Design a protein around this ligand. Structure first.
Ligand SMILES: *[C@@H]1O[C@H](CO)[C@@H](O)[C@H](O)[C@H]1NC(C)=O
Length: 233
């Protein structure tokens, strides 16, 4: 369970359940690293996704407002990211799951610099594949306030709930759960059950990393110490 400073992230974390979306791109489409290329001690590394040479942890950076920085955005988004997108462990293909049974994402993270978006940097998501929209988008502000925006059904705006406060530079553990049709997030074991409004049990998938919401060019920086996905149906 010791991370290896000499390995790429694929040697220190199970990246067989992830692909990586980057803030660079070509043809207005962002570069994506397939799971097969992330995996292993000799897997992908780049300028925004690399191993901390002091301790083996994962460092993810992302640039601010693309209108200023020129960074690449996914379709439908106006913000740049270095962010992991869940895939099927067997095939490497994009996946999603029903919120029946148990679906959790547990991450130990610290934020070194957050962006100046309304709520700060997005550090985890439950994405509703069924509506091509986020169900829950968790944010970390420059004051260390952790919040979540939950769309009021697929056509509604995000309702914001405060989840906790953690000072910048301090490690914390989050758990995002959408299980037995109940959405909840815990921060250091403090659990908040969240209203899902008019959402009709959408198929979803997890995202985790650094999705920079900045109004200005401010960079964001996230470090990850552990990341685990559980599906038990
Ligand atoms: C969890 O709740 C306790 C008790 O209200 C509080 O002292 C602590 O700051 C909370 N944790 C976070 C990360 O906000």
């Amino acid at each position: 369970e010791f991370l290896d400073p000499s390995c790429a992230p694929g040697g220190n974390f199970d990246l067989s359940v992830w692909s990586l979306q980057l803030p660079t791109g070509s043809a207005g489409k962002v570069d994506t690293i397939k799971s097969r290329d992330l995996q292993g001690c000799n897997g992908y590394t780049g300028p925004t996704f690399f191993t901390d040479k002091s301790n083996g942890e994962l460092i993810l950076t992302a640039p601010g407002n693309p209108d200023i920085t020129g960074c690449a955005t996914t379709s439908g988004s106006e913000h740049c990211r270095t962010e992991l997108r869940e895939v099927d462990s067997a095939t490497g293909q994009n996946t999603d799951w029903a919120p029946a049974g148990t679906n959790t994402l547990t991450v130990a993270m610290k934020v070194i610099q957050a962006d100046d978006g309304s709520h700060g940097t997005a550090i985890g998501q439950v994405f509703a594949a069924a509506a091509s929209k986020p169900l829950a988008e968790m944010y970390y502000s420059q004051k260390g306030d952790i919040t979540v925006g939950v769309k009021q059904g697929p056509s509604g705006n995000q309702a914001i709930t405060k989840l906790g406060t953690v000072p910048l530079g301090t490690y914390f553990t989050y758990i995002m759960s959408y299980s037995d049709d109940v959405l909840s997030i815990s921060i250091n074991g403090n659990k908040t059950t969240l209203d899902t409004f008019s959402w009709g049990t959408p198929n979803c998938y997890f995202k985790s990393g650094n999705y920079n919401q900045g109004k200005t060019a401010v960079t964001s920086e996230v470090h990850i110490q552990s990341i685990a996905v559980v599906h038990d149906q």
